[PDB]
């Protein structure tokens, strides 16, 4: 019974580590192989290692375990020429990106079918958006019929317009299907997470009964309504913390408040509204190309690097604006005659006659010039302010290009590199120090495959998760002494039963 | 009595750590919550961790404690279209930047009121300067009446000029109020710091009595006058180290010498003189925009990065100047005919006929070109020196752009990154190793919330500060044995009473 | 007998380290000095240290030892004006780069002669290619005889064309000789490596007998034919795992499948086909200049840096393409009139009338401009969309130049630096921690020249290799107890006989 | 007798550390304060810490001690508008840069006077060169009298030409004086160093008597003549390893061979020859401006960064040349018509008609363009090879600008940063781990000012140096037991008498 037996180590009343054996049913291990729960697990370890909250690590692990229980129970419910180059480039890009009662029963079966393949639905939506964007590359504009008129250039196939129309139709349909699948699959997970957070806060902190909700807490203030609900716990296990009559209005608006406040739900709603707007104008479908950035981990890291140092970037942009304003002040006061940008002398284009123009001209040209503001303005040849302009142009070029723009670029690059290094450090910590007790890697490295054996069966996270399922399923009376102790102390919400400092090998190294 | 009881650990005559309990009055803990003293505290730990002076760490801590006593006693005395885009950008910028006897009594009350809100006064001055600068963006120039004449463009509101005049008036008034508040609030702090430094030097080093003041010490030489003063100690506690008759002239000029030598006082005087000059010309108010750079920590770090490697930057600039001079020598000797910058052949603009022109032209164009001096000068097509110019232009472009400018930019970026890393390391050390004894983080990390308990009550800096207040207030006779010992050895100015290597937990780990 | 005596340390049945002495013949040590085996050794340590496979380190060492045995047995079988500047540059470059039965007997002697000097043959081929490329620099084109006609400019020597023809002839001949030498020298090595891998897999894993070959394994599926061969082991020692009749067809096609799947053989075949194509057009010889990149370690690292982050680079390129497509969409929808690139107004060159042109124009100009797409397009002077274009051009310039291109350049630079740092770390580990037991450097550093003595004789890799040769040559009956034990346990393919944790010095430090 | 007493720690026959006291004469400590010996000391520690030769550290220290003895004995023998901006810039630059028998007796006194102030003489030479270069900035050229004629522009002072002539005269005179001072001051030091190296090699290695001098050793082969000299040891202490008659010819040419092979002597000879050439043409004095680069440590590091990665830089330049040659091949074969650089169509300037022109044009324009070769060549508008040129220009721009030039710039920047980090690490090691025994910093940091006391008197390098002087001066008979033992074992040239692992504090920590 190698795959039906699980080994876990807990510290008991004896103040020493003790390994116990519990039966693992095939159903519990079967649900662990779903890609969704595996991705959630990887996200959990990534987040906890990045945060570094060792003190609250056990609480986060327990929350992750409860989230896994909810995910697998949900899965149980849902269980049954130039165009040639353009085509080549699109194919190359796609490739990597690639890499009564009976009516109610039918409706819930269709909803479960939609929930079963939701990532596949998102992939199909991405493919439809990519195809639509590729089709849009053939658009042409001309005054003559096929004001400005946008038409399609005559292609060899000739089926371009009906193909685009059909692709837009299935794109809208698949966006609706994806939002329905998300509402029926991942929305209950966040609903249960918020209900558990509220229940724990009310039970162990008195957030409402023993204290005020507080200030600057939208979630806390909004959560005020759930308490009076006849069903405050609906997606959380602890339930003791005719369709119109059964539905409770306050619970419905509360739950809706949870959904529309979710980031993923908001993103999917934005996708749906962009798909709807794409019918008014086909060029609106280009907004769906951003799903490549979110889907790819590297592109997501690139996007997050911009907001990683948002405060510092904003401060640097403000400093650059102040510096450019000072230089514009100096130019307006002393160097107005050098800002003529018209070749013809009949109508000179004075760019520094007004301060806003001198400011807009500076901010648009000097920053992007790469050699300073002196390149655009007239060269100081024979002027009485020759040394003064030369100094002005050298100082502007230096202080802007070599410092201000360089600082911003270095900040963005450093944020991206820091995020990549954080991911690499998370991976190295996971493959070096085990998650359960975090003992040194060399101690197990002395024994051949010591760390592999320590993580596979001795301190496997899946083993503890399956132990939690087994404790939940098994009755209190049938629990053994160690099982009863661990269950009673788990209901106490105090996690010192983990191996913590040491394991079985360290305790009895001489015996082993 | 949880908040009225303080626990501190000191090493006594028994050569072992010993925790003692002292009563904490509510008044002492109340004054600790002022933002000014908290900011001074953060600055103190930042400076001491950056310096790394572990040997003199206790002396710096004692000096900080005395400065806190003086700060809280002072607080006790003072205790009672295009314009739409421009508006949007200004609002966004501002946002972050933001985020007889009776007469004498009235005068001192007004002065205390000014001192109470000094940071708020500085914020109001910054807002006034920002508003004035925003107003100045609408300035326009034209020969015709509203020589060159500067007038205001016709705006929709039409209240622009009176608003600017009033804003300048309140800007000058608030600058005067801010300088008065600084003179009445922070000037006594630096006065007391200098008086304590002088007293300690005279008592424990014989800087004047037992030795010469020295050379290249402006502060030491100037401090010569305070000694003869009938009031050498005026803002320092150790006093034993009719208005015209009461005031001592020598003390007055000495104190004034302290004030005008202060960096912050000099900066505020520069602000005041710029505000005064702004009435002569409204464009002079742009100098006040630099307060954004000083106020923001990131912008202050950016400014300090320039001067962090000032010597290396100056040496690199000198090397670049020497290289450009050598290239100018070569061009003047061999490549004079290639420096014609006039399209019309009637009046050629020979830029290398004179060595200073060839030098000024090189230093202005070749550095900022980004592709070398060869871009500006005529291309060597068919010339007898084709290979020689090509080599000259390649060598110039390489040695300047790829090396000299790159070295300067990398030096600035490295200075900025080093300052940011120093701040991050200071923060990590503060949140990892406690300031009092500096024991390892893992030792307390073995016990859950061990470091938090160790820093909150076991080795709290505020606890030692409150103990110092309690010792100062309590009489010598009422002092206990440990209190008398610590007071007598504090008057000895020798700080080995700190826990130093170990604490209570390490000493009696088995018992605990 | 200093050079004829070898000392090695092994752990035996006594569970303690034990050094034994074995006779080293001069023949075994003589073959160790060949540059080929030394380069293979350096590559082996570099690869194993870079991989970091400590658990499989001993298996890799045993494989390297077997490869060395095969290499030395193979060696036993084969044992017996502007042109002046161009010339100066070519010489400087080359320098650094520089740095019946009797018939069968004659044929095998010629083949052995070719195999003896193969690196020299490659160097001669590189010299011939460099000379041909230098000759090609004098090519000129003109319509007139010596359609477009390519001829040779009249040189002072006048022997240019016959020299080029002869150089091409010997280049083709030396390419053929090099491919023959590689087939007769290094092809048997890879053949033996694949045969040993197959034998080990079949013996210890049941890859075919006890299991399926698997999926996505071209080598495993192709290796299916060798099994039925009457000679499955031909270049592997374990042989028990009329020319037409002797040759086995299945073995011949299997072996050929091994050769044409080799990277080095494929590269040499590409070299040969390029040499053959160079006769059709002499400009095809420029492909042979890539051998400089492969030959030089620094240039090879530079090339490998591009593919080190290939996935991230592809993702970044895709993100850049998506961003440029979005900007092209915006320009086509709103800023079509600003894309006129024709000076003459009679025939405007509308670059954004068609979406593909606007996309191709963007991807070709905006990326390489360095200041954004605004430089190429007309300046927005007086247009109703002045603020909108300014924002468009600033956002494009920022998001492309400062982020997208900077990220790609930083990724390439970081990959190159990471490869260089990996090589430096491999070297530091080799010169700091010995390969055999990996004890600390300081422990031997306490004793003067402790590490040198520990690596020269105590734990020399060459010593273990020579011990392996001595065990192979010596009969089983004549083996000593330790030798018999090590041989029997080596046939068990379990490598715990290495010193592993400790050596002789650590075991008996007090005695020593 | 605090400054006349020295404490050193040595390990004796008892195998334990033992501190002994020796009398320090005032003369020995007086000579230690010369700036020359201090700079030599700093250079010695910098070099030894950078090298990391712990095994040979004691030998290097002994060599440094002997060099100090020779330096102090030598000192004993020698002991007795636009021009306004240009002036401001020159002053600012200079500032930082700033920061019978009786006849023989007179000649040797003059030589000693020259040797006494040699750094001052070099500073005066640098000032003269800077003044001459500043004067040269006023040169002007014109056809008319004051072929091309170089004259001086009319200045306000009018004394420019005689001042320049006099400055050149004293520059030549001071260069001669500096070379004489170097010959009489530092040349004997290198002579003694080479004589000691030869003596040690002959005594302890048999470089000539017991073996051949070797190959690729210019110093070893040249040193062959000194052996037969009647005075092989002339500047080395171990002398037992009529002017025309006294001088030995072979020794004279040998010594001259030592001098002209020295780097500093060669640099000073180059300075002298440049000064001599400056009289023929005053513009030749610009070569002396390089002394700023050598004098300043930062500028010297900048110069050394170029040659730090010389091999890698050469390989990268060769790879860039090969890539540019391949691109030129492609352009010549397919894109010849796009290389017209003449605005007038009457005489097109075909830049790719000849391969060398296409190669020279590519290497001069594409590298320095910053946007690729596509900017200079005609835009592909409507051509049949539109996609092919676009791909060609994108690939060229990427592979050159983003990779090849970026790699070179990053290599130079990394070399400079590595040199700066090496200097910083040397400083940190010196201020953290003492040079003598290298014990941990924390061990002495436990005791207040423990490291300061450990380095000032316990393990002072100057203390060991003064002990060496005292042993040299004191007779063998008067030596004490420890002194006799250390002297006899120093003549054995084996340095295990250093404290090495531990010191007095570690040996008797309980007693202390």
| DSSP symbols for C160-219 | HHHHHHHHHHHHHHHHHHHHHHHHHHTHHHHHHHHHHHHHHHHHHT-SSSSS---SS-HH
Q: How far apart are CA D398 and CA C510, in angstroms?
A: 64
Q: How far apart are CA C11 and CA C9, in angstroms?
A: 7
Known binding residue A477? Answer is yes
Q: How many helices (H) and strands (E) does chain C have?
A: 25, 4
* Angle CA D275–D279–D284, to nearest 5: 60
- Identify which of C74, C92, C66 has the alpha carbon closest to the alpha carbon of residue C185: C74
Residue D284 DSSP label: G
Residue for token digits 């550390």?
Answer: D17
Q: How far is B313 from chain D (nearest CA, A)?
A: 9
Q: How far apart are CA C405 and CA C369, in angstroms?
A: 12
CB of A97 less than 8 A from some CB of C: yes
Map residue C383 onto helix, strand or coil: coil
Q: How far is A43 from chain C (nearest CA, A)?
A: 20
Map residue D10 onto helix, strand or coil: strand
A459 burial level (CB within 10 Å; 0-12, 13-18, 19+):
buried
Q: How far apart are CA D5 and CA D456, in angstroms?
A: 12
Backbone angles phi, psi at C262, to 5 degrees: -80, 140
- Identify which of B137, B141, B162 has the alpha carbon closest to the alpha carbon of residue B151: B141
Q: Select the residue of D96, D136, D148 nearest B318 (Cβ to Cβ).
A: D96
Q: How far is B291 from chain D (nearest CA, A)?
A: 29
Nearest CA in chain B to D371: B371
Backbone angles phi, psi at C6, to 5 degrees: -120, 140
Q: How far apart are CA D21 and CA A307, in angstroms?
A: 66
Backbone angles phi, psi at D344, to 5 degrees: -75, 130
Q: Select the residue of C142, C292, C364 nearest D319 (Cβ to Cβ).
A: C292
Method: cryo-EM
- Identify which of C83, C138, C132 has the alpha carbon closest to the alpha carbon of residue C286: C132
CB contact under 8 A, A321 and B93: yes
Collect all residues with Cβ–Cβ distance below 8 Å to D511 and sequence separation of at least 6: none
Collect all residues with Cβ–Cβ distance below 8 Å to D487 and sequence separation of at least 6: D471, D476, D479
Classify the C-alpha dihedral B336-B341-B342-B347 as positive or negative: negative
CB contact under 8 A, D413 and B390: no
* Other CB atoms within 10 Å distance of the CB of residue B176: 13
Resolution (A): 2.8
Q: How far is C60 from chain B (nearest CA, A)?
A: 38
Q: How far apart are CA D396 and CA D399, in angstroms?
A: 5
Q: Which of residues 134-163 of B touch A (CB under 8 A)?
A: 136-142, 148, 153
- The Cβ-side half-sphere exposure at A325, using a 13 Å CA radius, reads 27
Residues of B in contact with C387 (CB under 8 A): 81-82, 85
H helices within B296-354, ranges in order? Answer: 297-308, 310-334
Map residue D133 onto helix, strand or coil: helix
Breaks (C-N over 2.5 A) in chain D follow: 80, 99, 146, 241
CB of D371 less than 8 A from some CB of C: yes
Structure tokens at A350: 């004075």
CB contact under 8 A, A374 and B364: yes
Map residue B432 onto helix, strand or coil: helix
User: Which DSSP string corresponds to D409-434?
Assistant: HHHHHHHHHHHHHHHHHHHHHHHHS-
Q: Select the residue of B85, B386, B391 nearest C387 (Cβ to Cβ).
A: B85
Q: Select the residue of B140, B296, B416 nearest A407 (Cβ to Cβ).
A: B416
Q: How far apart are CA A182 and CA A175, in angstroms?
A: 11
Residue for token digits 């990471």?
Answer: C418
Q: How far apart are CA A398 and CA A402, in angstroms?
A: 5
Chains touching chain A, criterion 3+ CB pairs below 8 Å: B, C, D
CB of B387 less than 8 A from some CB of C: yes
Q: How far is D137 from chain B (nearest CA, A)?
A: 5
Residues of A in contact with B83 (CB under 8 A): 356
Structure tokens at D311: 């091999």
Q: Which of residues 53-82 of B touch C (CB under 8 A)?
A: 81-82
Distance of alpha carbon C163 from the chain centroid: 33
Classify the C-alpha dihedral D372-D376-D380-D381 as positive or negative: positive
Q: Which of A278, A364, A451 to mutate to test the interface with C (most CBs of C within 10 A)?
A: A364
Known binding residue B38? Answer is yes
Q: How far is C363 from chain D (nearest CA, A)?
A: 9
Nearest CA in chain D to A84: D387
Q: How far apart are CA A159 and CA A165, in angstroms?
A: 10
Q: How far apart are CA D330 and CA D392, in angstroms?
A: 9
Chains touching chain B, criterion 3+ CB pairs below 8 Å: A, C, D
Contact assessment for residue C324 and residue C367, using Cβ atoms and an 8 Å cutoff: yes
Contact assessment for residue C89 and residue B391, using Cβ atoms and an 8 Å cutoff: no
Q: Select the residue of A302, A364, A446 nearest C316 (Cβ to Cβ).
A: A302
Characterize B392-411 residue by residue with b for buried, 16 or more Cβ atoms within 10 angstroms of its Cβ, and e for exposed: bbbebbbbbbbbbbbbbbbb
Q: C82-98 and D310-334 helices cross at what angle (nearest 10)?
A: 130
H helices within C186-309, ranges in order? Answer: 187-204, 218-222, 224-228, 243-246, 249-260, 263-280, 291-295, 297-308
CB contact under 8 A, D397 and C368: yes
Contact assessment for residue D160 and residue D138, using Cβ atoms and an 8 Å cutoff: yes
Map residue B150 onto helix, strand or coil: strand
Residue spans per domain, chain A: 5-77+435-507, 90-185+267-295, 187-261, 310-419
Residues of B in contact with C391 (CB under 8 A): 85
Contact assessment for residue D312 and residue D166, using Cβ atoms and an 8 Å cutoff: no
CB of D387 less than 8 A from some CB of A: yes
CB of B327 less than 8 A from some CB of D: no
- Identify which of B124, B233, B118, B232 has the alpha carbon closest to the alpha carbon of residue B185: B118
Contact assessment for residue C350 and residue C339, using Cβ atoms and an 8 Å cutoff: yes
Q: How far apart are CA C109 and CA C115, in angstroms?
A: 10
Structure tokens at D302: 């900048």
H helices within A186-212, ranges in order? Answer: 187-204
- Identify which of B149, B56, B19, D388 has the alpha carbon closest to the alpha carbon of residue B6: B19
Residues of A in contact with C375 (CB under 8 A): 368
Map residue B402 onto helix, strand or coil: helix
CB contact under 8 A, D394 and C96: no
Q: How far apart are CA C361 and CA B296, in angstroms?
A: 42
Characterize D323-336 residue by residue with b for buried, 16 or more Cβ atoms within 10 angstroms of its Cβ, and e for exposed: bbbbbbbbbbbebb
Q: How many helices (H) and strands (E) does chain A have?
A: 25, 4
Nearest CA in chain D to B356: D137
Q: How far apart are CA C177 and CA C171, in angstroms?
A: 10
């Amino acid at each position: 019974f190698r795959p039906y037996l699980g080994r876990i180590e807990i510290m008991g009343a004896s103040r020493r580590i003790e390994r116990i054996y519990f039966e693992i049913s095939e159903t519990n291990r079967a649900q662990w192989e779903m890609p969704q729960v595996k991705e959630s697990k990887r996200q959990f370890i990534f987040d906890v290692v990045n945060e570094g909250g060792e003190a609250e690590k056990m609480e986060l692990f327990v929350s992750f375990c409860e989230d896994t229980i909810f995910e697998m129970q949900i899965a149980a419910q849902i269980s049954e020429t130039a165009r040639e180059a353009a085509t080549a480039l699109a194919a190359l890009l796609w490739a990597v990106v690639a890499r009564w009662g009976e009516l109610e029963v039918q409706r819930v079966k269709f909803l479960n079918y939609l929930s079963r393949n939701f990532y596949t639905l998102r992939f199909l939506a991405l493919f439809l958006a990519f195809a639509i964007n590729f089709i849009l590359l053939f658009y042409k504009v001309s005054d003559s019929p096929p004001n400005m008129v946008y038409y399609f250039l005559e292609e060899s196939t000739g089926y371009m317009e009906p193909a685009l129309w059909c692709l837009s139709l299935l794109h809208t349909l698949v966006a609706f299907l994806c939002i329905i699948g998300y509402n029926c699959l991942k929305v209950p997970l966040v609903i249960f997470k918020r209900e558990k957070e509220l229940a724990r806060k009310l039970e162990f902190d008195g957030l409402y009964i023993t204290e005020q909700p507080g200030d600057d807490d939208v979630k806390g203030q909004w959560d005020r309504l759930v308490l009076n609900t006849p069903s405050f716990p609906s997606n959380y296990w602890d339930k003791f913390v005719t369709w119109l009559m059964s539905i409770d209005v306050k619970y419905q608006i509360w739950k809706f408040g949870v959904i529309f406040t979710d980031n993923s739900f908001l993103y999917l709603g934005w996708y749906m509204v962009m798909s709807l707007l794409g019918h008014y104008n086909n060029f609106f479908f280009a907004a769906h190309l951003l799903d490549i950035a979110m889907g790819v981990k590297t592109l997501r890291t690139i996007l997050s690097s911009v907001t990683h140092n948002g405060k510092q970037l904003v401060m640097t942009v403000g400093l650059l604006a102040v510096v450019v304003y000072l230089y514009t002040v100096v130019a307006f006061n002393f160097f107005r005659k050098f800002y003529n940008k018209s070749e013809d002398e009949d109508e000179p284009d004075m760019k520094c006659d007004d301060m806003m123009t001198c400011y807009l001209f500076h901010m648009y040209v000097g920053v992007r010039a790469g050699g300073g503001i002196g390149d655009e303005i007239e060269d100081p040849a024979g002027d009485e302010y020759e040394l003064y302009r030369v100094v002005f142009d050298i100082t502007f070029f230096f202080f802007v290009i070599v410092i201000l723009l360089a600082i911003i670029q270095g900040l963005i690059i450093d944020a991206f590199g820091e995020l990549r290094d954080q991911q690499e450090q998370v991976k190295e910590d996971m493959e070096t120090k085990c998650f359960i007790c975090g003992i040194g890697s060399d101690y197990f490295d002395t024994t051949p495959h010591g760390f592999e054996t320590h993580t596979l069966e001795e301190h496997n996270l899946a083993n503890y998760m399956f132990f939690l399922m087994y404790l939940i399923n098994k009755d209190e009376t049938e629990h053994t002494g160690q099982e009863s102790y661990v269950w009673k102390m788990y209901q106490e919400r105090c996690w010192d039963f983990f191996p913590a400092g040491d394991c079985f090998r360290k305790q009895y190294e001489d015996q082993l």
